[PDB]
Design a protein around this ligand. Structure first.
Ligand SMILES: Nc1ncnc2c1ncn2[C@@H]1O[C@H](COP(=O)(O)OP(=O)(O)O)[C@@H](O)[C@H]1O
Ligand SMILES: [Mg+2]
Length: 303
């Protein structure tokens, strides 16, 4: 009946997220969490950045869990508020977004009560996050320059590749240097988006390495070839597609580059990137072995 001492939960929700269903389900979500032993309060975002500001406040308020209810943008904002701070609360995910790339990476159920079941059962994993200069990200950073835009919206695999103009770049990654013309670079943490079921065949969410993709300057035949290979997940076999794993990545150019970070405009170069290994403790299903995780100790072998 009462298996644990009372805990504290804070729900940070975006009422405009996805189908905009969560707000009406909040009272029933509170009931479920309270019966499970969580004194639960809630905060509704009103604009960009609100979830970050709330997560920052919540750091001083001694919570056991921060539950983020919204899309990747809401999750990104919550992580940005708690990243690199001592005594971080565990993160609960309710994937209420239009796209839920981080949720899919952790096999978070796409229904509210199922997502809550995962949090209540209390099994958690640690995932890498990315630091870019003085901000953080959880899914992907992308960079490149348009010919003669899409860097403000969600990046759907290699679909923007024909739009890219070859630009001379310097990418320093773990002591190695790429110096030359590139159409595009990706720094992946998670491994699935719209255009790729797998950005890379062997990516891990908790290995401390970014998935570094550099697409070099390509002629029209190489472009068509890359696109053909990308459509069946064989893009990393092409000689103009560089794939490396790296922890620290420093990027610069004497020419202008637009940046996209977790599906939103992430400003301008130069950009220093650091993988914060297994930085965020996040509730995950105990009944699914995750192929993108090295550490599956959260999984019960009898399930
Ligand atoms: N009340 C609000 N009205 C409009 N925009 C908001 C509100 N609260 C948060 N936002 C912003 O909307 C963005 C999209 O939220 P997200 O949770 O990613 O949903 P979706 O998956 O639908 O994009 C967030 O990055 C956030 O900055
Ligand atoms: Mg990795």
């Amino acid at each position: 009946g009462s298996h644990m001492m009372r805990k504290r939960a804070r729900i940070i929700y975006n009422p405009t997220s996805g189908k905009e269903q969560f707000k009406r389900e909040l009272p029933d979500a509170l009931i479920k969490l309270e019966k499970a032993g969580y004194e639960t309060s809630a905060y509704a975002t009103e604009k960009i950045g609100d979830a970050t500001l709330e997560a920052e406040r919540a750091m001083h308020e001694n919570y056991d869990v921060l539950i983020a209810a919204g899309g990747d943008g809401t999750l990104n904002e919550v992580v940005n508020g708690i990243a690199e701070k001592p005594n971080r609360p565990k993160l609960g995910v309710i994937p209420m977004g239009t796209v839920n790339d981080f949720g899919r990476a952790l096999h978070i159920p796409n229904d509210i009560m199922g997502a809550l079941d995962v949090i209540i059962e209390g099994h958690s994993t640690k995932v890498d996050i990315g630091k870019m200069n003085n901000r953080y990200f959880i899914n992907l950073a992308a960079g490149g320059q348009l010919t003669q835009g899409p860097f403000a919206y969600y990046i759907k695999g290699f679909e923007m590749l024909p739009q890219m103009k070859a630009v001379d770049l310097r990418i320093e990654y773990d002591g190695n240097v790429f110096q030359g013309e590139a159409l595009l670079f990706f720094l992946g943490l998670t491994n699935s988006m719209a255009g790729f079921e797998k950005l890379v065949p062997d990516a891990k969410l908790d290995d401390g390495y970014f998935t570094l993709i550099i697409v070099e300057k390509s002629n029209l035949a190489e472009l068509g070839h890359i696109m053909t290979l990308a459509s069946r997940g064989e893009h990393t076999k092409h000689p103009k597609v560089i794939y490396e794993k790296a922890k620290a990545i420093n990027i610069s150019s004497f020419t202008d580059l637009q940046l996209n970070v977790d599906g939103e405009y992430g400003g301008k170069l130069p950009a220093n990137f650091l993988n914060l290994e297994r930085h965020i403790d996040v509730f995950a299903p105990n009944d699914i072995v995750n192929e993108e995780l090295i550490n599956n100790d959260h999984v019960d072998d009898n399930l």
